[PDB]
């Protein structure tokens, strides 16, 4: 998780994918990760839930 | 160093907002998990909660 943090990953799309893959979600909310092209909307989505 | 103090304050204020953002939802899911846990684990479908 520290290798997938800011200290080794700089791109927020790749870091958002590495944060959002490492839990066991439900399927439709994995689609709401995957659907969003905005950085801030999917980061506020994963920060919310 | 005044720029560094402004940078640390602009980090810490919005970081405290994000700290409030999951500190509300932590207590919300504290209220959410345990009722479904206890009337899932007590008996089950044969526990005739229906």
From TrEMBL, chain A:
Induction (record text): By heat shock.
Cell compartment(s), UniProt: Cytoplasm
Tree of life domain: Bacteria
Family: Belongs to the peptidase S16 family.
Protein role: ATP-dependent serine protease that mediates the selective degradation of mutant and abnormal proteins as well as certain short-lived regulatory proteins. Required for cellular homeostasis and for survival from DNA damage and developmental changes induced by stress. Degrades polypeptides processively to yield small peptide fragments that are 5 to 10 amino acids long. Binds to DNA in a double-stranded, site-specific manner.
Assembly and binders: Homohexamer. Organized in a ring with a central cavity.
Name assigned to this protein: Lon protease
Native source organism of the sequence: Thermus thermophilus
């Amino acid at each position: 998780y520290q290798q997938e943090a800011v200290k080794s990953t700089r791109d927020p799309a790749i870091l958002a994918d590495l944060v959002a893959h490492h839990a066991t979600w439900t399927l439709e909310e994995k689609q709401t990760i995957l659907e969003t092209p905005e950085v801030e909307e999917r980061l506020k989505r994963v920060l919310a839930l | 160093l005044l720029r560094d103090l402004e940078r640390f304050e602009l980090d810490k204020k919005i970081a405290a907002r994000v700290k409030e953002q999951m500190d509300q939802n932590q207590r919300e899911y504290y209220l959410r998990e345990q009722m479904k846990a206890i009337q899932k684990e007590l008996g089950g479908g044969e526990d005739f909660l229906t």
